[PDB]
Design brief:
Two copies of one chain form a homodimer. Chain A has 76 residues and is an alpha+beta fold. Helix content of chain A is 11%, strand content 22%. Chain A contains one helix and three strands; from the N terminus they run E-E-H-E. Chain A has one helix at 58-65; strands at residues 27-32, 39-42, 69-75. The first copy, chain A, has a two-stranded antiparallel sheet with strand order 2-3. The relative contact order of chain A is 0.18. Bound molecules: FE2/S2 (inorganic) cluster (2 copies) and chloride ion (2 copies). Chains A, B: One of its GO terms (biological process) is regulation of cellular respiration.
């Protein structure tokens, strides 16, 4: 292996969110359980066109970057 | 401005999650509302020592990377 090709362990510099609500300095969503339906599927990858809800965009992120992120599900 | 210093718009290559459950190919958490307390604060930045719960680690991520991510709150 040629070590000159490898980026050694380092403190992350890359953003997670690239586009969503970029005039908001810290994006938080807060929901009351009363308002939720039977199931809500929330995005944790910041790629969904339906953010804060998951639309399956994580599958593209994971395949493209080698990551393993997925949504948070709250069900009733 | 010296344009030679600027990385032009491009499709993301960087991972979001760097360390959590890396033997899991797609990390999903699912909770029943019945089991939730008055308030649950869920991490969307993949930096929390208490993942899937938010412990405020997002503030370090945001300051270090210039990002603007934050948690998802479900309250009852
Ligand atoms: S689209 Fe982001 S977690 Fe599914
Ligand atoms: S620690 Fe990740 S969103 Fe707060
Ligand atoms: Cl996936
Ligand atoms: Cl912050």
């Amino acid at each position: 292996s040629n070590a000159r090709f490898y980026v050694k362990d380092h403190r992350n510099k890359a953003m997670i969110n690239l586009h969503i609500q970029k005039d908001n300095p810290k994006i938080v969503h807060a929901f009351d359980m009363e308002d939720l339906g039977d199931k809500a599927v929330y995005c944790r990858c910041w790629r969904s066109k339906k953010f804060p809800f998951c639309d399956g965009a994580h599958t593209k992120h994971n395949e493209e970057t080698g990551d393993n992120v997925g949504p948070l599900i709250i069900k009733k």
